Design a protein around this ligand. Structure first.
Ligand SMILES: OC[C@H]1O[C@@](CO)(O[C@H]2O[C@H](CO)[C@@H](O)[C@H](O)[C@H]2O)[C@@H](O)[C@@H]1O
Ligand SMILES: OC[C@H]1O[C@@](CO)(O[C@H]2O[C@H](CO)[C@@H](O)[C@H](O)[C@H]2O)[C@@H](O)[C@@H]1O
Ligand SMILES: OC[C@H]1O[C@@](CO)(O[C@H]2O[C@H](CO)[C@@H](O)[C@H](O)[C@H]2O)[C@@H](O)[C@@H]1O
Ligand SMILES: [Cu+2]
Ligand SMILES: [Cu+2]
Ligand SMILES: [Cu+2]
Ligand SMILES: [Cu+2]
Ligand SMILES: [Cu+2]
Ligand SMILES: [Cu+2]
Lengths: 333, 333, 333
């Protein structure tokens, strides 16, 4: 395979490494490295801890971006400082359980997998060692996404280009933290110690936490998403294990691929869309109003009470044609 | 803004205020009033009670109908007889958290919000005061829907008009009523008294009841939906917090916008469709057979055991070509 | 009704009785027989038992295949060896609650129902006796599917024929097996004895098991699905009561009707699709790589821990262009 090689410097979510939308490049071998990290992390503002397992130290794993017909060559590294075997399954790839059957590595090993990007869209990647370890590694945080863009960039299905000014990747994580007898979340010394209680809870199908970017409030305050009025923002949303229903409070999905695959035309003008567990989808919105937006899953219990709220802070001029407070709050006459 | 004003007299669900589909009117300011009512109601045939919070006294709130490019001017009233602050978020609107950031009113106040109907479809509206109150007010009943019709009426995406003979609005409500130690549903003196137990249950994500129009059996008996053979009926379905999968038992969705947005062509000939939590969708069906139909969510446990069944009673002539009982029940030979 | 009659010999899932895709036949009366069987079965590799109720002895019931405009004439038989009344509701049919209102039969009876296949697609059929028996009979196993093909066969919505080399029917079943005090699954002497505990669990909406073809591991080992590289396989998936999110691990859905209705064009290039509870959908894939695939619902907890995994064993030549292990596992440098 005698194609040009291109290295990518991955960046932590919700940001996305620099890339072209439309490109004049032909196929390349695009090189990525992912280093697995098992680590205890804090997942809420109460200080609850969690035995996480991650690609590149983040939940979600970073977004990888290539174009249709590229070859994606991933060096997956499992340092000796980890305790368990791991692998990678790319839903964008064809064969060998998405790559999982070719990438199982013990602590102290690395492996190099290449796959041809024959399907466009956004796709989940995740660890999948075998058997009951599959769900456990995924809900412990071992999932991310890859975006395979058409070489001509995105289109509306009507002949028009859809160019985004910026893209964010929102990875949603269902987490299963057990409680003790008096009702407090438990803490564990190792993922292995957490396994028995965690699996018992997993099988009951109700998460304790549903978070974006690994933690309650991760995408708020200093780390709010941003935009300006007039900017077209692409929001990639993934969920490797469980359904979600994204919604931009005060906005819309102007163009939405809820099944996430660019061979299909987008839907237009959505209020709320649906990410099937085990998939990524994408929504584009051109901001029209400044101020705070919340980006949620629209199970509002999940959003407000279990962790699944991000914010956008948007700069620009208020549009009184689109909305106005005709009369401020006043005593009823 | 010097456009003509038009008042609407809202009507309680499942009925819909009179409106045009295709219209020769240009944009107007369409005036609506919603008066919040907190009230204890009965939600099942056992007499279980529920601390409801409502727009205009109903669950769901009434369906508002306008056309693309209208301005929707809502007077939201929170009488002093209520206990809590409330607001309104229109998923059809652009800016200020759907209007929620411009409509927070204490008991004794009213506010007037106007928004431009730039997106077509059916959309959820709901209360959203802030924080954990968001889910609580919504699952207490504070949600309804708005329909923004194209000025040319509905179409099939193939150049043909789709005209409905009547429309019904089915609002589905997930309810969380706690149980005491011996397993009976609890009753509370106020919404505030219900809050702690109700939130604890909410976070476990399993409703005690799933109802249409506020109560088990609301859309049955005297209050069954009706049609005649040959009539095209539009069924708007909303769910502000939780997924649903509508199905007309003995019928179909001839034309379905399950994401609910009229810029997209309908799907055809569905058995069951999917309303994402936080959205409204719509289905049209031309009745072909008389008799009783059930309209359900097709989690049949929810439908038959938790409350989520409506009936249609349909008049007309039986069509033996479409279905016939060739041989009535008889002893096996 | 003076049309030619054609008998079908049904075959147990996941296989499908022989049929034409495109056909030069005109409408016929296609005759099917379904004999209900109530039976205690084993559903997992631990030996857990289950009070099943079935059409033709299988979970799911067998796939029936006809063409648009055929008349489907079903003899439904409820032998005296059963204990309960049963009926059948075809989501493909128009009128009388899908046929349920014309097919209620006591043990010792049979009934003959005919319906005209006016809607194309894959559709659920299920028992629906009335009231709380509806969900109970369905989650006890009394559901299957029917496929109504266009007379010209399937198409891509772009003028091209889509011909499958083989079809499999995967019926997914949510099961509710109660546990005793010490946490073991309970066994019952009759469906009636199982009812009280089973309904109590049903209403909590969390299954104990989620299986394909009636049992954990049913579609693995000797009974793995099969294909060859180059074969186009249609996978019909149904779920009569509860959502699912199918995914072919190492493959894709090349053409997917997730709402299952052939009047709509398929989506292309999906990773994971969505079967709404109360529906059947279908996905076509042309295999490109040999080896083992898993076909799952992509709630991976359900897939790996509750029973919902099938395998494909695929023969043919490995394609190193599409995927290659560039470097086998090795010590990190
Ligand atoms: O106080 C003993 C009494 O408490 C229970 C819980 O209801 O068990 C608690 O105490 C045990 C002995 O200290 C612990 O092992 C156990 O984990 C804790 O729940 C009863 O089982 C016991 O009779
Ligand atoms: O009978 C007392 C015994 O019952 C429990 C429940 O198992 O508590 C009940 O009685 C308490 C005292 O009357 C109530 O406060 C409580 O709400 C009720 O559940 C035990 O905790 C107690 O030992
Ligand atoms: O040992 C009696 C004590 O056990 C409990 C369960 O905590 O009930 C068990 O024993 C009863 C009498 O044998 C059984 O009927 C019951 O089904 C079983 O759970 C207590 O209720 C009882 O005090
Ligand atoms: Cu892993
Ligand atoms: Cu996967
Ligand atoms: Cu409120
Ligand atoms: Cu909302
Ligand atoms: Cu039955
Ligand atoms: Cu049904």
């Amino acid at each position: 395979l005698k194609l040009p090689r291109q290295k990518v410097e991955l960046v932590a979510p919700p940001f996305v490494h620099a890339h072209e939308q439309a490109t004049k490049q032909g196929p390349k071998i695009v090189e990525f490295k992912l280093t697995i990290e098992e680590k205890k992390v804090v997942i809420d503002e109460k200080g609850t801890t969690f035995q996480a397992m991650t690609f590149n130290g983040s939940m979600p794993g970073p977004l990888m971006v290539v174009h249709e017909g590229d070859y994606v060559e991933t060096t997956l590294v499992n340092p000796a400082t980890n305790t368990m075997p791991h692998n990678i399954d790319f839903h964008s790839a064809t064969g060998a359980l998405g790559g999982g059957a070719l990438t199982l590595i013990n602590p102290g090993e690395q492996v190099v997998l290449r796959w041809k990007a024959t399907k466009t869209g956004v796709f989940v990647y995740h660890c999948a060692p075998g058997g009951p370890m599959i769900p456990w590694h995924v809900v412990s945080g071992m999932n991310g996404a890859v975006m395979v863009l058409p070489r001509d960039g995105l289109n509306d299905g009507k002949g028009h280009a859809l160019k985004y000014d910026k893209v964010y990747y929102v990875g949603e994580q269902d987490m299963y933290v057990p409680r003790d007898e008096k009702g407090n979340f438990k803490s564990y010394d190792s993922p292995g110690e957490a396994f028995t209680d965690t699996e018992e809870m997993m099988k009951k199908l109700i998460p304790s936490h549903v978070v974006f970017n690994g933690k309650v409030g991760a995408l708020t305050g200093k780390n709010a998403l941003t935009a300006n009025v007039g900017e077209n923002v692409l929001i990639v949303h993934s969920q490797a294990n469980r359904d979600s229903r994204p919604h931009l409070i005060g906005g819309h999905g102007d163009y939405v691929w809820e099944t996430g695959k660019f061979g299909n035309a987008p839907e237009v003008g959505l209020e709320t869309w649906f990410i099937r567990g085990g998939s990524a989808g994408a929504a584009m919105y051109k901001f029209m109003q400044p101020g705070i937006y919340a980006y949620v899953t629209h199970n509002l219990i999940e959003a407000a009470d279990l962790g699944a709220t991000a914010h956008f802070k948007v700069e620009g001029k208020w549009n009184d044609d689109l909305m106005t407070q005709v009369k401020a709050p006043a005593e009823i006459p």
